[PDB]
Design a protein around this ligand. Structure first.
Ligand code: CDL
Ligand code: 3PE
Ligand code: 3PE
Ligand code: SF4
Ligand code: SF4
Ligand code: SF4
Ligand code: SF4
Ligand code: SF4
Ligand code: FES
Ligand code: K
Ligand code: ZN
Lengths: 115, 210, 96, 48, 125, 176, 388, 108, 96, 264, 113
């Protein structure tokens, strides 16, 4: 059928409220994190990442899935605000050490058998 | 009890009893109970619809003939083939009657389960483990978050389609003066053996063919 | 049975030795390349062929329960000998 | 050895002041006991 | 009580699999072929899902077989072809399907070994 | 059966109470504990003077893996890969080919000693008593690579401890 | 919340039970909320076992409760035998019960000594740890490994006791009762010990059952329950011993249930050195327990089995089972599914500590900070079993 | 020998990494290490600390402390006997006895 | 077991016990470290007749669970088992 | 059609065309009677007597591989009368078989091995000595340790009917019967390598592949053959990123389950 | 005659077990009225509850009454009695007697897969 038990919301309209609230939550918080964890990146970049993280799941349309992303998002937010994470965990969205993997076909053909 | 030392002596007394107490429950709570079966080595199982998580456990904790005060264990078992992949399990010990019984339900990735914390307080941490390791969500949980996995860890490791070695591995990079997580590459790949045998072992459990 | 390759590295019984051009052999600089010099394929040729008077003879590496599993060796073919599967000792039917 | 001592201290060794062309007057270590004695000194057996 | 959802189910954003191992890998669904060295058919029962092979390279030090593919050993079992596929779609893995190839029945007749005027007449036993 | 470990009801007679009073105001019980320790000060300590003495072991002890030989000299391992198939930690890597004389023997035999758990399943599985755990337990190294044994490093242990590995099995193989 | 403290055990004091990162909230000195963070020692045991044959998986169980080694192995073995529908031989069941109580001595010696170490009473640690050594030698001589034996196995044990072992085990048991008295003479009646334990960490009987407590966390609250006397498994229906019971359900009682139990084991060991029967030590069924070497090296039918049983392992009928034992810490138990092949499909483990630790917050309400030290110890927590 | 039983992190000379090292616990390991006043020697004890031991292939295991700190001695065994470890310590003492800190300085 | 006569009295007086009877150190009561070879017995299935495996096969006996009540396909009330009988105090030492 | 008939497997009805064998009757319900001599692609021989099964209400067990079914039989495929038959038969096969599993290439994928576990007993009473045969030499591919043979007459039948070269045969009688050419000959044929597959025991084994690997440590990657335009289906078996051997993959419409030597 | 203490911490000694039981047992019987007779819960709860109620009246002394109920100490039986009331209350709103709410997919409980 199509009926399925809801988690928190009941339609895309309800969900976006949580999502929008979630962005509000993160946006206000990135500045403190940068000072709190003595990070070495600009408050501009931190808020850029959050927009990137929110942008990677735009095409999601099932209300139930969007609920989970927020719940995890809230959980992940709780850890940072409460400083359960550590300066190592926060910097793990940036990949300060991994080399820039080329995306063009030609460069990939040079390096390895990567499909 | 038979003079076959290399074999487990049955116990028909406890097999009849738990059959009796099984029919008993199937009649009290027919709203939810989908199936009750007893294993040949004297264990009782109460398969239920997930909705009846609270009524069924509350009944077994308080009823005069149940008195299953203690929740021995609570876990999950993934099964990809089934549509409802996960399968929650409750093992309850009744100190009064010196007996055990197992209650099983089902769910999937999205559909949440009703938190049973109100019935047993023991089920608080267990229900985070299930959420932490499998990804099942428990509605109205007092406090739900990863317990075993690492902060920022992504994925539910005890799922069947989560690779053993994982996806990242920490190490120390002197350039950034901190531990850094990188894609996992192994000096030696895990060697998957094919240990099965191509011959039917137990005729009893044979399944019907196509 | 010990030999030294033109590189200056003794060859292991398996028959592996880094060629002159290879770089990995740097790992032995300042240290030594461990090598066992009791080449088994040599110490098994020294042993003499035992002469027995039956078609079928059984070997278990000596010691019984402390050897390899018991096997039976057929010695009819005089164009060669009979060799144990596990231990390698050879047998021959005498004067036949 | 001394058999009047409690089980563990009856048997002891005094390493050589030189082994394999190295001065061990002070720098002894537990890997300087040849295997034959190694079994007796650890009480793995009774016959030296 | 219950909401109505019609969309195509998908969970790829709530599993934590890096995108590099979603849009690139090619899961494969099939019924394993019987090991030809034996005769027991009790391994061509269930449906297996496995992913394509990738690079394995000699370790510089010990010559071991290294790799950087987390899914190399991953293998899932299913009871039916449909369940196997329904696991691929909702996980967003491009997949191929192979039809089961069950042996065709055959006419076994001992007496055919001795025919008055046919070539089934054997010559040794 | 059962028994109450703490259910006493101290008598409240004057002598009884004065005892408890005599206990509190004079630290009698605390003194009694000091007596016990003062006795240990006059007992021979249980310290063995390692390395000149060694804590006792038994012939079953599990130590450094090693590869044995027949009395003739031939190798015992025949690349049956049972030890490799049961080693729970998968620390054994075998690669064999027919030998120049046609025999069945290994070419690669590495026992990564940082994944071994010294379970002992390897020697339980070997059908020819080839791979055995010697009694040596003092081989700590100064670099990681030295703990990645290869076949040459295993035999040398065999050709170095056989004077004791052989004796132990003689002592204990009957229980197996 | 006057001030919240994230008490971390990074500089692990000599506890040998893992490191606990504890998140608390002191309203001055009281504790208004204690929050444990445990995952530091989660290695994925419950997921590795999916890739191991039933034999290969056994050593994992020596590494959950690494002070109760053989006890764990017994739980895993009982579960598999029950699945396999086979019964070990009586001599093995006595050895397992013999060692199952020797381990209980090893475990309780660890709990009391460390628990007394965390509170500064240091001397008893050394005295009793000299008894552990001699107790390891018994572990050493039957299996060859001082700590992790893998001795017990589905279908019995591995090897028989070497000649002259039981003479030593008897000798050890003879003197041990004096050792405990050397201990109770320090802590039992000492006023300082009572101050740190009396009326601390009180748990009501009704709450314990709901919170899933098992073992001495029950019997402290006066509940009469011990799986040996109620659901016996190997022979425990053939030994006389009395189950200690608490009265006030605080730390001091649980210190007396444990000390009392350590005596009741000497009462059981004494019995197992007398009732031990002659016979073999593994199920006489060469499709489950591997055959003797001498028969492996002589008979074909046996050689095959030594082959399959050490490469493919032994199948197991499909089915699920929950099996629990009165492990020294609590009710250790494993829920273990099996799909018919040689590898378990799932192995949930019911570590006794995991339940107790959840109850840490409940017991530390309205207690000073230094009591959180005593409360953790009295639960007898080892983080190998908790996180797995 | 001189090896006191317990020493705080800041008074220590040698760290003994006895036991497994899960990812979650790795960051605090380094943090403690960096706080050790030099000279500081690290001893890896057991199979799970040399190379990740039994749990080598697990997702939440660090495959040896040497990934996280520079090790000086590797004590093999699961677990090493108490006497095996004691040998490892007595191995370090000899290592500290072969240093030429002054001589190297004298010839710069 | 070497402490002079005087000291033995002392530590006996302090500890109050008689420590010289039960000594924490082992001196001679230990077994011999070199025991004679054993001869272990065989199990009940070691025979030569009337020993067919099918009659003593534990694994094949087990059956799938009996489905007591399946949904797809005056009476009294029964407890899971009779209530557990009260435990009796210990006559050996009912109170510590 | 009406030609079908009803037969019972452990009380369960099943429709089978007339002339179907018991063994094939039990196939349609998912049961698989053991078998050593019988190959569905080889002429019936019925000599291993390892497939003996009990038909209810009859004194003598019939050999499923050959005996056709009859209207309304009840094939007791698990009765204690059938089991004792198999343990007895499996006992004889291991009477003179050698203790070669630890060095036998077939070890780990051996029907005599597995079927011994799942059907045969588990301890031996054979107190005598064992037979021991000389080894032939029939080509630079098919290694042959004929001590391990069990006179199943697979290699013999396959060569005659499939390959078309009848150089294989039985020469002798009784316990001294042997399999070979009786002369110094090489059984060289474009399909020669197959006899390695069918030989259920480790008698015939690939010489190039000898001693290199064990069946449990190889990853089987189903693939295709390109040596010739026949497009044979194969199962490349790799290990640690290296090809170790090649095995046929069944495809009834192309190559049944054989592949030419060049492919192999 | 009254116990100095039940034994189980957190369990005070009751003074009027019979009156307290009769009140509670009476209340339990009261609630069952609002449950349809057909419901198996009612008939089973009544059957046992009546058996206990009779044993309350007949035995005049506290002690032997326990040996008739076998629910351990007398206070526990009261505490057990309270639960049954609280359980009986909740059953009204949950309506267990209703038919099976839903059926599982075809192969939900099939095992082994
Ligand atoms: C404070 C005043 C008390 C002085 C106590 C010194 C003493 O001699 O008492 C030993 C004497 C032996 O006591 P024990 O423990 O029963 O002897 C059993 C041992 O096994 C002892 O038996 P043993 O056969 O093993 O004895 C062998 C020992 C023989 O030596 C001894 O045992 C005692 C030597 C002490 C000399 C002072 O040989 C050694 O090992 C020599 C090592 C060096 C010992 C230290 C000497 C210097 C200490 C004094 C420096 C400051 C003054 O103690 C007493 O009897 C005290 C009685 C009261 C006298 C006051
Ligand atoms: C006619 C004229 C008569 C005039 C005189 C009349 C009075 C004389 C008789 C009374 C003398 C009283 C002596 C006073 C000393 C203090 C004793 C005391 O009361 O301490 C009590 C203290 C706490 O009391 P508590 O045990 O907890 O009882 C519960 C109370 N609610 O408990 C404690 O004491 C705690 C002890 C802490 C120290 C323990 C560790 C050290 C113990 C070993 C050292 C023993 C002493 C060594 C002496 C060295 C001398 C140089
Ligand atoms: C010195 C080493 C200790 C020797 C052994 C001590 C001993 O055993 O004496 C015990 C005695 C009373 O012991 P206890 O069991 O508590 O009897 C209580 C009766 N109300 O304890 C005593 O009688 C000694 C009490 C002394 C208390 C301090 C006296 C003055 C301290 C400064 C001098
Ligand atoms: S002791 Fe165990 S883990 Fe170590 S190498 Fe041998 S089999 Fe492997
Ligand atoms: S060591 Fe033993 S078990 Fe391992 S491959 Fe060699 S012979 Fe086989
Ligand atoms: S298995 Fe061995 S190395 Fe690993 S944590 Fe346990 S004792 Fe340490
Ligand atoms: S053919 Fe089979 S039974 Fe015979 S030796 Fe080879 S593996 Fe063993
Ligand atoms: S050699 Fe192989 S195929 Fe030929 S008869 Fe013997 S077992 Fe059968
Ligand atoms: S399969 Fe029937 S006799 Fe061979
Ligand atoms: K073959
Ligand atoms: Zn030989």
């Amino acid at each position: 059928s199509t009926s399925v038990k809801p988690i928190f919301s009941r339609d895309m309209n309800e969900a976006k409220r949580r999502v929008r609230e979630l962005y509000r939550a993160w946006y206000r918080e990135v500045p403190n994190t940068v000072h709190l964890f003595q990070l070495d990146i600009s408050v501009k970049q931190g808020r850029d990442k959050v927009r990137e993280m929110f942008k990677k799941n735009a095409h999601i349309t099932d209300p139930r899935v969007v609920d989970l992303l927020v719940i995890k998002g809230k959980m992940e937010l709780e850890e940072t605000i409460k400083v359960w994470k550590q300066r190592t965990h926060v910097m793990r969205f940036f990949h300060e050490t991994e080399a820039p993997r080329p995306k063009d076909f030609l460069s990939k053909f040079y390096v390895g058998h990567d499909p | 009890a038979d003079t076959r030392p290399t074999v487990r002596p049955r116990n028909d007394v406890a097999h009849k009893q738990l059959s009796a107490f099984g029919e008993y429950v199937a009649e009290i709570l027919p709203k939810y109970v989908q199936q009750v079966q007893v294993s040949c080595f004297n264990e009782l199982e109460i398969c239920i619809h997930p909705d009846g998580v609270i009524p069924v456990l509350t009944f077994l904790r308080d009823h005069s003939n149940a008195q299953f005060k203690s929740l021995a264990d609570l876990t999950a078992v993934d099964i990809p083939t089934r549509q409802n992949r996960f399968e929650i399990v409750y093992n309850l010990l009744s100190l009064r009657f010196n007996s055990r019984i197992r209650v099983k339900t089902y769910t999937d990735e999205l559909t949440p389960i009703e938190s049973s914390v109100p019935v047993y307080k023991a089920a608080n941490w267990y229900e985070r483990e299930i959420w932490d390791m499998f990804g099942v969500f428990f509605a109205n949980h007092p406090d739900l978050r990863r317990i075993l996995t690492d902060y920022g860890f992504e994925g539910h490791p005890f799922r069947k389609d989560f690779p053993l070695s994982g996806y990242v591995e920490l190490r120390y990079d002197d350039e950034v003066k901190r531990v850094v997580a990188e894609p996992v590459e192994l000096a030696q790949e895990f060697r998957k053996f094919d240990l099965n045998s191509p011959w039917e072992a137990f005729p009893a459990y044979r399944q019907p063919p196509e | 049975g010990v030999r030294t390759s033109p590189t200056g590295e003794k060859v292991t019984h398996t028959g592996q030795v880094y060629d002159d051009g290879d770089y990995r052999k740097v790992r032995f600089v300042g240290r030594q390349k461990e090598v066992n010099e009791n080449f088994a394929i040599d110490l098994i040729a020294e042993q003499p062929v035992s002469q027995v008077g039956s078609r079928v003879i059984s070997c278990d590496g000596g010691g019984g329960a402390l050897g390899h599993p018991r096997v039976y060796i057929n010695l009819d073919k005089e164009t060669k000998t009979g060799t144990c599967g596990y231990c390698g000792l050879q047998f021959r039917q005498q004067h036949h | 050895e001394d058999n009047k001592q409690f089980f563990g201290r009856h048997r002891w060794v005094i390493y050589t002041t030189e082994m394999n062309g190295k001065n061990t007057f002070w720098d002894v270590d537990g890997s300087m006991v040849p295997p034959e004695w190694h079994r007796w000194l650890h009480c793995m057996t009774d016959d030296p | 009580q219950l909401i109505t959802v019609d969309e195509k189910l998908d969970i790829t954003t709530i599993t934590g699999v890096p995108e590099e191992h979603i849009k690139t890998r090619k899961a494969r669904i099939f019924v394993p072929a019987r090991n030809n060295m034996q005769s027991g058919v009790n391994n061509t029962k269930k449906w297996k899902m496995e992913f394509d092979t990738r690079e394995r390279w000699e370790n510089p030090l010990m010559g071991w077989a290294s790799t950087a593919d987390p899914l190399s050993n991953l293998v899932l079992t299913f009871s039916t072809k449909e369940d196997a596929v329904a696991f691929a779609e909702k996980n967003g893995w491009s997949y191929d399907v192979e039809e089961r190839k069950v042996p065709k029945p055959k006419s076994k007749s001992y007496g055919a070994n001795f025919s008055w005027n046919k070539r089934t007449r054997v010559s040794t036993k | 059966t059962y028994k109450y470990v703490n259910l006493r009801e101290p008598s409240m007679d004057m002598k009884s109470v004065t005892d408890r009073a005599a206990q509190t105001l004079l630290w009698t019980e605390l003194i009694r504990g000091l007596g016990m320790t003062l006795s240990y000060l006059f007992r021979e300590p249980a310290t063995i003077n390692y390395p000149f003495e060694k804590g006792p072991l038994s012939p079953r002890f599990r130590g450094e893996h090693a590869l044995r030989r027949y009395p003739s000299g031939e190798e015992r391992c025949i690349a049956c890969k049972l030890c490799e198939a049961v080693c729970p930690a998968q620390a054994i890597t075998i690669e064999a080919e027919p030998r120049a004389d046609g025999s069945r023997r290994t070419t690669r035999y590495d026992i990564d000693m940082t994944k071994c758990i010294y379970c002992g399943f390897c020697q339980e599985a070997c059908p020819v008593d080839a791979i055995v755990e010697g009694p040596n337990f003092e081989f700590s190294t100064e670099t990681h690579e030295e703990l990645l044994y290869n076949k040459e490093k295993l035999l040398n242990n065999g050709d170095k401890w056989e004077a004791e590995i052989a004796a132990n099995i003689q002592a204990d193989y009957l229980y197996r | 919340l006057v001030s919240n403290l994230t008490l971390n055990f990074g500089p692990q004091h000599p506890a040998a039970h893992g490191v606990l990162r504890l998140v608390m909230e002191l309203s001055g000195e009281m504790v208004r909320k204690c929050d444990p963070h445990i995952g530091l020692l989660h290695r994925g045991t419950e997921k590795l076992i999916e890739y191991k044959t039933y034999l290969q998986a056994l050593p994992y169980f020596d590494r959950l409760d690494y002070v109760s080694m053989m006890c764990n192995e017994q739980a895993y073995s009982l579960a598999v035998e029950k699945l396999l529908n086979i019964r070990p031989p009586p001599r093995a069941q006595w050895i397992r019960v013999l060692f199952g109580e020797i381990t209980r001595l090893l475990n309780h010696i660890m709990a009391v000594t460390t628990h007394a170490l965390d509170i500064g009473a240091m001397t008893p640690f050394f005295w009793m740890f000299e008894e552990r050594e001699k107790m390891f030698e018994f572990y050493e001589r039957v299996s060859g490994a001082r700590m992790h034996a893998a001795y017990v196995r589905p279908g019995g044990v591995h090897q028989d006791l070497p000649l002259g072992l039981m003479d030593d085990i008897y000798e050890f048991s003879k003197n041990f009762s004096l050792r405990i008295d050397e201990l109770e003479e320090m802590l039992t009646n000492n006023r300082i010990w009572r101050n740190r334990t009396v009326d601390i960490g009180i748990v009501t009987a009704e709450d314990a059952l709901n919170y899933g407590f098992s073992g001495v966390m029950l019997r402290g609250s006066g509940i009469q329950w011990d799986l040996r006397k109620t659901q016996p498994y190997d022979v425990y229906d053939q030994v006389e011993f009395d189950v200690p019971i608490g009265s006030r359900g605080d730390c001091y009682d649980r210190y007396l249930c444990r000390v009392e139990e350590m005596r009741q084991s000497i009462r059981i060991i004494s019995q197992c050195l007398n009732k031990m029967p002659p016979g073999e030590i593994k199920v006489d069924d060469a499709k489950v327990s591997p055959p003797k070497r001498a028969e492996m090296k002589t008979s074909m039918e046996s050689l095959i089995h030594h082959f399959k049983l050490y490469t493919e392992g032994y199948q197991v009928p499909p089915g699920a089972t929950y099996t629990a034992i009165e492990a020294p810490k609590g009710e250790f138990g494993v829920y273990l599914v099996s799909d018919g092949s040689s590898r378990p499909y799932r192995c949930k483990i019911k570590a006794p500590g995991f339940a107790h630790l959840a109850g840490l917050d409940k017991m530390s309400k309205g207690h000073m900070l230094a009591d959180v030290v005593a409360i953790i110890g009295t639960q007898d927590i080892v983080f190998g079993e908790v996180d797995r | 020998f001189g090896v006191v039983f317990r020493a705080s992190p800041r008074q220590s000379d040698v760290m003994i990494v006895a036991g497994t090292l899960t990812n979650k616990m790795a960051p605090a390991l380094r943090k403690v290490y960096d706080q050790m006043p030099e000279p500081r020697y690290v001893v890896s004890m057991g199979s799970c600390a040399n190379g990740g031991g039994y749990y080598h292939y697990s997702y939440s295991v660090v495959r040896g402390c040497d990934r996280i700190v520079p090790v000086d001695i590797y004590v093999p065994g699961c677990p090493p006997t108490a006497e095996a470890l004691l040998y490892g310590i007595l191995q370090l003492q000899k290592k500290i006895k072969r240093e030429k800190r002054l001589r190297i300085w004298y010839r710069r | 077991a070497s402490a002079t006569r005087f000291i033995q009295w002392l530590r006996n007086w302090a500890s109050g016990r008689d420590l010289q009877a039960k000594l924490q150190l082992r001196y001679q009561e230990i077994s011999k470290r070199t025991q004679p070879p054993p001869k272990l017995p065989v199990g009940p299935s070691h025979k030569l007749s009337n020993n067919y495996y099918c009659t003593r096969d534990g694994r094949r006996e087990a059956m799938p669970p009996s489905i007591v009540m399946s949904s797809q396909k005056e009476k009294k009330a029964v407890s899971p088992a009779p209530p557990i009988k009260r435990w009796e105090l210990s006559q050996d030492e009912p109170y510590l | 059609a009406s030609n079908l008939i009803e037969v019972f497997v452990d009380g369960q009805s099943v429709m089978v065309e007339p002339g179907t064998t018991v063994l094939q009757a039990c196939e349609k319900v998912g049961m698989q009677i053991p078998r050593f001599c019988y190959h569905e692609r080889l002429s019936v021989a019925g000599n291993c007597r390892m497939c003996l099964v009990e038909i209810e209400k009859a004194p003598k067990v019939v050999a499923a591989c050959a005996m056709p079914v009859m209207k309304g039989w009840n094939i007791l495929t698990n009765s204690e009368k059938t089991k004792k038959a198999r343990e007895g038969v499996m006992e004889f096969l291991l009477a003179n078989h050698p203790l070669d599993c630890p060095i036998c290439d077939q070890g780990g994928e051996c029907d005599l091995q597995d079927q011994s576990m799942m059907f045969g007993s588990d301890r031996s009473r054979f107190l005598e000595g064992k037979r021991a045969v000389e080894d032939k030499n029939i080509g630079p591919l098919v290694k042959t340790i004929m001590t391990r043979c069990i006179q199943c007459t697979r290699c013999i039948r396959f060569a005659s009917e499939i390959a078309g070269v009848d150089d294989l045969g039985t020469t002798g009688r009784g316990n001294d019967m042997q399999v070979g050419t009786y002369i110094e000959k090489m059984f060289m044929s474009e399909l020669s390598g197959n006899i390695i597959d069918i030989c259920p025991v480790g008698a015939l084994t690939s010489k190039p592949y000898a001693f290199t690997a064990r069946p449990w440590e190889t990853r089987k990657t189903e693939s295709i053959d390109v040596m010739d335009a026949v497009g044979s289906n194969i199962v490349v078996s790799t290990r640690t990123g290296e090809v170790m051997r090649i095995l046929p993959r069944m495809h009834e419409d192309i190559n049944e389950e054989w592949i030419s030597d060049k492919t192999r | 005659l009254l116990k100095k203490t039940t034994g189980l911490v957190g369990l005070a000694v009751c003074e009027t077990p019979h009156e307290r039981l009769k009140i509670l047992y009476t209340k339990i019987l009261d609630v069952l009225g609002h449950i349809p007779k057909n419901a198996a819960y009612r008939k089973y709860t009544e059957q046992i509850t009546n058996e206990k109620l009779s044993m309350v009246k007949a035995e005049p002394d506290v002690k032997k009454l326990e040996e008739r109920l076998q629910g351990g100490q007398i206070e526990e039986v009261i505490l057990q009695a309270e639960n049954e009331l609280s359980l009986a209350r909740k059953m009204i709103q949950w309506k267990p007697w209703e038919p099976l709410v839903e059926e599982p997919p075809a192969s939900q409980w099939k095992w082994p897969i």
